[PDB]
Amino acid sequence: AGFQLNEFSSSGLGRAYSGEGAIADDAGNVSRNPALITMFDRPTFSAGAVYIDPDVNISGTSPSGRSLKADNIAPTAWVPNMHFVAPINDQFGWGASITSNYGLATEFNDTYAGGSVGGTTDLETMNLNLSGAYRLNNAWSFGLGFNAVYARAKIERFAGDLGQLVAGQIMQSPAGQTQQGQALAATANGIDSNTKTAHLNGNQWGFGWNAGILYELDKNNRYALTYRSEVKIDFKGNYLTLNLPEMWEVSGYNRVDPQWAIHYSLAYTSWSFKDAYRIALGTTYYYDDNWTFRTGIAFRDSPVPAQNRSISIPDQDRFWLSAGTTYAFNKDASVDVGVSYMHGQSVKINEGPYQFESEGKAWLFGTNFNYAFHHH
């Protein structure tokens, strides 16, 4: 957040989401690349959730003299996931998942000076996916997926100190000399910071598709190109379209040893004019039959000026640092747990009449349970 999320699995969390289009140790990855369906030879289920605990802080002084300070403006969150994939044939398979690829939340007191650009911003999203895949031969697979997205938005803004700003401007102008001018300033200054200035509530569905190609040099090495379509969501509440952006991703996975694999990816996102990319690299330690270990790093760059930035929507250049571990109870069942630390960069924000600074980070903790059907 983002507002884009990667938290589709706890195993992925532990590898900082690196080459997620090319690994297939559990069912979570089919949501990332429907072509991976052909790596599964038996019905496979997975479920869990990621707990996100952000710490995002705003600082600054308004030209009115009011503090623009705001501690801890991003609340914690639970992001659940469920996945299922199952072969139909030696060539065909299918899968289904419930995920969220998008969400954000910021809240300021309704008494905050910068209220007109920072009150309450709440977007929750749920992706429903059905996928199919076709294996052409030993090397090549293709996957196609259909997405139903449910989105719940809540916005409120407030006057903040706007009326104090207007009072300032009026008093400064020649009109500050007149009696009508003073009165008009006083009327503006007298507007409560907590005056509700805006309010939106909406819940809507949108639809999209996604596709993927898998190339396997052999059972230890593979590469993938994936594409997620944009999804548009028209809230008839009150325009008013919310645009979930395209994503392209290239992934690679190298099992360079019975005990070691690496996995990396480049992912690209453009929207609207303003794009972003993410690179990620990680390694997996297949210690033994019971224990697997997991570590990764990532970096995301969306170079957005500063007068295009929002305090209500934090989007900085960020780093991920992750470790994880999978314990398998047997050849059928396992549990993943992931941890990640997410670090933003202190950034300047010039929005409306205000100048802020913003710095954020987050701790992530995830657990998934995996189960494959038809012993063993």
Ligand SMILES: CCCCCCCCOCCOCCOCCOCCO
């Ligand atoms: C590349 C072709 C696949 C693209 C189609 C996308 C939607 C496919 O979803 C179909 C899922 O339906 C599940 C069928 O249930 C299995 C029935 O047969 C199982 C026998 O083993």
Ligand SMILES: CCCCCCCCOCCOCCOCCOCCO
């Ligand atoms: C009977 C005359 C009494 C004068 C009261 C007029 C209204 C006083 O409120 C003024 C509020 O303006 C705040 C000043 O803002 C800081 C100055 O710099 C801001 C430039 O706009």
Ligand SMILES: CCCCCCCCOCCOCCOCCOCCO
């Ligand atoms: C548009 C192609 C971009 C390729 C990037 C990833 C390729 C990784 O595989 C390279 C090694 O594979 C050996 C080549 O295999 C023989 C020809 O088939 C390769 C087509 O991908």
